Amino acid sequence: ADVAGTSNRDFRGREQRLFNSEQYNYNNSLNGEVSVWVYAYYSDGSVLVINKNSQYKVGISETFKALKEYREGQHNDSYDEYEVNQSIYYPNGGDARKFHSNAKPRAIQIIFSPSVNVRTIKMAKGNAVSVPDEYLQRSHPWEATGIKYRKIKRDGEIVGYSHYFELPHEYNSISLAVSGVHKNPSSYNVGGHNVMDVFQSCDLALRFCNRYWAELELVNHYISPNAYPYLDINNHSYGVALSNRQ
Amino acid sequence: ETFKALKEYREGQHNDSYDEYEVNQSIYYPNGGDARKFHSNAKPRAIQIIFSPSVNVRTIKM
Amino acid sequence: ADVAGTSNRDFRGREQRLFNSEQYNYNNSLNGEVSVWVYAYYSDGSVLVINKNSQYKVGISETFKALKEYREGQHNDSYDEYEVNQSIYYPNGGDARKFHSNAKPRAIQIIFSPSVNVRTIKMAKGNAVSVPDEYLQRSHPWEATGIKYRKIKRDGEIVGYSHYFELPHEYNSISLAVSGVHKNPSSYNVGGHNVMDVFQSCDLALRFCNRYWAELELVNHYISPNAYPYLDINNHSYGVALSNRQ
Amino acid sequence: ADVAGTSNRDFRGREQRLFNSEQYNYNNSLNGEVSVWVYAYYSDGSVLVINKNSQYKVGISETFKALKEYREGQHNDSYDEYEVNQSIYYPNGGDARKFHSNAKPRAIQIIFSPSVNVRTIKMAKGNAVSVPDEYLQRSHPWEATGIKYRKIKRDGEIVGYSHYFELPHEYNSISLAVSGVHKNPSSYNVGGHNVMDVFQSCDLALRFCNRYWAELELVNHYISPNAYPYLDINNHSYGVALSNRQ
Ligand SMILES: Nc1ncnc2c1ncn2[C@@H]1O[C@H](COP(=O)(O)OP(=O)(O)OP(=O)(O)O)[C@@H](O)[C@H]1O
Ligand SMILES: Nc1ncnc2c1ncn2[C@@H]1O[C@H](COP(=O)(O)OP(=O)(O)OP(=O)(O)O)[C@@H](O)[C@H]1O
Ligand SMILES: Nc1ncnc2c1ncn2[C@@H]1O[C@H](COP(=O)(O)OP(=O)(O)OP(=O)(O)O)[C@@H](O)[C@H]1O
Ligand SMILES: Nc1ccn([C@@H]2O[C@H](COP(=O)(O)OP(=O)(O)OP(=O)(O)O)[C@@H](O)[C@H]2O)c(=O)n1
Ligand SMILES: Nc1ccn([C@@H]2O[C@H](COP(=O)(O)OP(=O)(O)OP(=O)(O)O)[C@@H](O)[C@H]2O)c(=O)n1
Ligand SMILES: Nc1ccn([C@@H]2O[C@H](COP(=O)(O)OP(=O)(O)OP(=O)(O)O)[C@@H](O)[C@H]2O)c(=O)n1
Ligand SMILES: Nc1ccn([C@@H]2O[C@H](COP(=O)(O)OP(=O)(O)OP(=O)(O)O)[C@@H](O)[C@H]2O)c(=O)n1
Ligand SMILES: [Cl-]
Ligand SMILES: [Cl-]
Ligand SMILES: [Cl-]
Ligand SMILES: [Mg+2]
Ligand SMILES: [Mg+2]
Ligand SMILES: [Mg+2]
Ligand SMILES: [Mg+2]
Ligand SMILES: [Mg+2]
Ligand SMILES: [Mg+2]
Ligand SMILES: [Mg+2]
Ligand SMILES: [Mg+2]
């Protein structure tokens, strides 16, 4: 046979490049996943991740309470934290024994897979009682924030999209939903002849949630093993470039 | 359902709740937790999915 | 001196082979140990080991309750498990809040040292109230199960003997005793002139019991450090061949 | 065929009588069990049973502490009961918060199977520090109390033997061992050529222990299901007559 790495008959090399290219393009076909992650960062360095993976479109919706840190199998000041929530929902409405709950998120990062169409991203960032914009009567139910998403890049390929916002102020008390639609450059509407498949996709979407102890542990044990995209506090991008690559 | 939500939960009894968080860390990534057991007895041993006779079987997806 | 590994005057080599041969043969003399182990395997992957080491003869006897998993320093559903035992002892005799206790053994492995005579092995595998065969009136107090023991082998030498039985069914609820006699190819009865020494051996026998978390941990921290024989779930034999070996 | 119950060719009837006769006689052969039970009765009506079943000979030996009531999975005044034991072991040696522990047995019943030879029964009823008769120097290590055993009888057959003694006085604080030898009307000594089998029987003996809540529950769920002999507080005998019976 020909010698490796010297000719156009390195079929092991051609198959490796096609296997990676096929994964990148399959993910972008309408048979592929679109995924979203919400990372809620806590002052003790831990991070809650919520991920949803589904075909056609995907989203996550959480209450203010559900985004608060919860330490499985440890104490969580559970009664005082009910009194915190009462004061968050209406000023001076509770009798908590703390000024700031350390279970409140300090920041949110939203990440989408590179199979999303960024112009379809929508976010409902509500106040603590789940109203998008002060009163329901004047609220548009979402904002289209795609322009704010940064490209997470590795070896020049877009491996995902990130929108990150800090919640550093005492009044940064939110509920949150976010949604994106899978790329569809064709003129076949996936909600036309395929409408009931999109309805089944709402049932088939897989969810994951877990609290990791540190961004390092998230990087090492959650992002990297699964070939997910990420952007850490130091603005370093993580992910795997696949199109036309070995 | 998530992997966690399918695990056994005994309402009103002990559930090894802290050790079971450490189990989940090791399930999510090998050697990622510090649990005090090799196999959680809260893991399902089997799943049965049943549909009513009004389903069309050719539309089932998992 | 002669060069190592080239002549009949490698006395360091001859002494190493005699030191190993002397250990194998000492164990088989009447001055040597005979040992037995009962491994009770639990569904959480942990394993209770009971070992007895004694001269002349050796055995272990445990109740149904004593073979159930007990996690030192953790919760054990201790009250519900009393109600489980009542229902095991007589159908519908307890008020437990579970159908199957995960503290019941899923399997037993009995291992003897290679100094046992296999034709002397006896086992009393009782029901949960410690009756060998349904009712005491028709029970022979043991079965001689030596024919079932497999040879655990390493480098062609018998390093021990194994009888393994699963308890996979809900009705597999046992009490257990097992006994073997040390090899004695001579016509000197150890219970003749030496009878009171055999009585002292009943007091001198050393016992060990402990629950390990996994078969891996048993292999690494219990079987291997002590040069004990074992057979794991994959039918791999562990032990150290010594007769005529360096 | 002949009609049932009218001729000497009712072979189903002859086989039923032989099956029962064979059980009674097998139990009395040297291949059969000999069994002993110690029942310790508590003031709350519960009963601890300890049973041992073995070939050739059988016994039970317990400390004063081990005979005290223990409620699995409930509170047992465990610290105060250590202080009780100190005062039982030497007058005024503890600092308990009670005059009489309700965990002390109020009575003991010893029962042997009908395969025991009553003239071989021995009992060591010690004081609370495990001395048979005041000081070790003047103690014979047992008393042969066979003459005191009553025959438990059903349909005129001896189904077992009972010795019962109350412990109603505050000074009735005991340790206890008891032992009997299986019948052997032959001149073959089971400790002669068969000595090492008797040594293995010491390992093969099966033990059971459990606390039942009431004599009724003992009768219904422990004695009767297993065809064991018993004598209740009302002097009623329980057991199954088998010799020459259908
Ligand atoms: N020294 C170089 N000269 C020319 N091209 C390079 C060099 N190093 C890498 N490249 C190529 O340039 C393209 C961009 O890769 P690069 O590593 O700059 O992007 P990235 O990893 O997305 O961003 P960065 O490395 O800046 O965080 C890829 O095709 C890569 O193979
Ligand atoms: N390739 C070989 N040819 C001939 N003899 C060998 C070879 N490999 C090992 N032996 C010898 O064969 C005997 C059996 O050793 P072997 O390793 O087969 O037994 P084991 O470890 O009991 O069983 P196994 O290895 O099959 O689990 C020993 O004397 C060993 O030194
Ligand atoms: N009315 C009777 N007349 C003659 N023999 C009888 C009668 N009733 C029972 N028997 C027989 O008498 C023998 C003794 O049985 P019996 O029921 O008196 O003994 P038990 O049950 O040991 O004692 P008890 O019934 O007094 O507690 C048995 O052979 C039995 O079949
Ligand atoms: N505003 C607050 C906070 C706490 N407590 C009291 O202090 C006890 C413990 O507080 P809790 O907030 O429940 O914390 P932990 O028990 O430490 O944590 P968890 O309940 O999460 O296990 C409570 O039962 C409640 O009596 C209270 O009165 N008022
Ligand atoms: N890997 C594990 C498991 C348990 N524990 C400790 O042991 C205590 C009890 O364990 P937990 O798993 O919480 O079990 P339970 O309290 O018995 O059950 P639950 O919490 O479900 O009521 C915990 O508080 C924690 O201190 C631990 O350090 N590490
Ligand atoms: N059939 C059962 C099981 C448990 N419980 C009750 O629930 C409490 C806790 O159950 P237990 O079985 O003792 O379990 P743990 O306390 O979790 O474990 P351990 O006692 O082994 O520390 C008990 O005190 C008893 O009140 C009960 O009524 N009935
Ligand atoms: N002479 C006694 C008896 C009890 N106590 C104290 O009271 C507490 C409870 O008593 P204990 O005898 O341990 O009873 P329980 O806790 O009710 O039962 P258990 O320990 O059997 O669960 C103990 O921790 C010990 O502080 C004591 O000082 N002196
Ligand atoms: Cl497509
Ligand atoms: Cl010898
Ligand atoms: Cl016989
Ligand atoms: Mg806990
Ligand atoms: Mg609390
Ligand atoms: Mg780069
Ligand atoms: Mg080999
Ligand atoms: Mg002799
Ligand atoms: Mg308890
Ligand atoms: Mg206590
Ligand atoms: Mg009668």
From Swiss-Prot, chains A, C, D:
Keywords of the record: Glycoprotein, Host cytoplasm, Late protein, Signal, Viral occlusion body
**Where is it localised?**
Host cytoplasm
The record, for InterPro entries, names: Cypo_polyhedrin_Cypovirus1
What extra comment accompanies this record? The sequence of strain H is shown.
Protein name per the record:
Polyhedrin
Instruction: Say what the protein does.
Output: Major component of the virus occlusion bodies, which are large proteinaceous structures (polyhedra), that protect the virus from the outside environment for extended periods until they are ingested by insect larvae.
Q: Which cysteines are joined by disulfide bonds?
A: none
From which residue to which does the signal peptide run?
A: 1-26
Glycosylation-annotated residues = N27, N76, N85, N235
Q: Is Signal among the key words of this record?
A: yes
GO cellular component terms given for this protein: host cell cytoplasm; viral occlusion body
